Amino acid sequence: RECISIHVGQAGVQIGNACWELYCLEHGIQPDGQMPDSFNTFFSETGAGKHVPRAVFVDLEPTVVDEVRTGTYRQLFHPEQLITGKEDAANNYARGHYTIGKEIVDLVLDRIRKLADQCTGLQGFLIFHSFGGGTGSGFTSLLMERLSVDYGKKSKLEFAIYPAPQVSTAVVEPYNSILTTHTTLEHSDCAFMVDNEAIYDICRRNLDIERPTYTNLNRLIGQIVSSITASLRFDGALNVDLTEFQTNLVPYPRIHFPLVTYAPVISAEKAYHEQLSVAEITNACFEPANQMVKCDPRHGKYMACCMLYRGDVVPKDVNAAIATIKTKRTIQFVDWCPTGFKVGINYQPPTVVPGGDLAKVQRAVCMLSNTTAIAEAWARLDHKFDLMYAKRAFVHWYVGEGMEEGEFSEAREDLAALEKDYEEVG
Amino acid sequence: RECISIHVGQAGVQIGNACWELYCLEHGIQPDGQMPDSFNTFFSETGAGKHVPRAVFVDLEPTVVDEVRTGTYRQLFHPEQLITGKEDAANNYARGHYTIGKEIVDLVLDRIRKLADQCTGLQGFLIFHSFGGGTGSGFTSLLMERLSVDYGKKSKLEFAIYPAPQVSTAVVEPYNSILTTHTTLEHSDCAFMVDNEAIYDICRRNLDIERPTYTNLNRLIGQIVSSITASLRFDGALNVDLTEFQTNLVPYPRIHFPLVTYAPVISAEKAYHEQLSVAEITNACFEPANQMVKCDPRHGKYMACCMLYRGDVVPKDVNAAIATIKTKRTIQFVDWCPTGFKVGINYQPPTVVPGGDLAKVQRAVCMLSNTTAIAEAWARLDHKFDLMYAKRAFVHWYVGEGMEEGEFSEAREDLAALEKDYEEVG
Amino acid sequence: REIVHIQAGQCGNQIGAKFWEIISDEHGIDATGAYHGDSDLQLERINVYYNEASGGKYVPRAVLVDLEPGTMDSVRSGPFGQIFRPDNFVFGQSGAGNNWAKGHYTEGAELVDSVLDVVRKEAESCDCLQGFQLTHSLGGGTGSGMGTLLISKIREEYPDRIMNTYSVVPSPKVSDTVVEPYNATLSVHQLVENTDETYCIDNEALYDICFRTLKLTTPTYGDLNHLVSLTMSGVTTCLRFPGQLNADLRKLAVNMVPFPRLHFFMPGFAPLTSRGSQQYRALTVPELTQQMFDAKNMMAACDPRHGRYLTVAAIFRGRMSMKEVDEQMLNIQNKNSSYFVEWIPNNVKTAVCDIPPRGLKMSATFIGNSTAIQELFKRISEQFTAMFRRKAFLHWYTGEGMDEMEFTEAESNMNDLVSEYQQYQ
Amino acid sequence: REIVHIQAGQCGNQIGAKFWEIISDEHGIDATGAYHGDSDLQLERINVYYNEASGGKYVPRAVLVDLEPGTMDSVRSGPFGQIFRPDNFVFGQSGAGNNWAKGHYTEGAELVDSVLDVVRKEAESCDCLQGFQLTHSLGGGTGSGMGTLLISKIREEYPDRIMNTYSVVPSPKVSDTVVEPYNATLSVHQLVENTDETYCIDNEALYDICFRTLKLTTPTYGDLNHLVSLTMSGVTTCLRFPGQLNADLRKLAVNMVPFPRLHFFMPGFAPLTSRGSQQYRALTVPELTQQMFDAKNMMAACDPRHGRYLTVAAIFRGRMSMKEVDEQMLNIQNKNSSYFVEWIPNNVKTAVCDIPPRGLKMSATFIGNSTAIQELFKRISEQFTAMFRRKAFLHWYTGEGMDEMEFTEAESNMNDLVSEYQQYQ
Ligand SMILES: Nc1nc2c(ncn2[C@@H]2O[C@H](COP(=O)(O)OP(=O)(O)OP(=O)(O)O)[C@@H](O)[C@H]2O)c(=O)[nH]1
Ligand SMILES: Nc1nc2c(ncn2[C@@H]2O[C@H](COP(=O)(O)OP(=O)(O)OP(=O)(O)O)[C@@H](O)[C@H]2O)c(=O)[nH]1
Ligand SMILES: Nc1nc2c(ncn2[C@@H]2O[C@H](COP(=O)(O)OP(=O)(O)O)[C@@H](O)[C@H]2O)c(=O)[nH]1
Ligand SMILES: Nc1nc2c(ncn2[C@@H]2O[C@H](COP(=O)(O)OP(=O)(O)O)[C@@H](O)[C@H]2O)c(=O)[nH]1
Ligand SMILES: [Mg+2]
Ligand SMILES: [Mg+2]
Question: In this entry, which stretches build a coiled coil (chains C, D)?
Answer without folding.
Answer: none
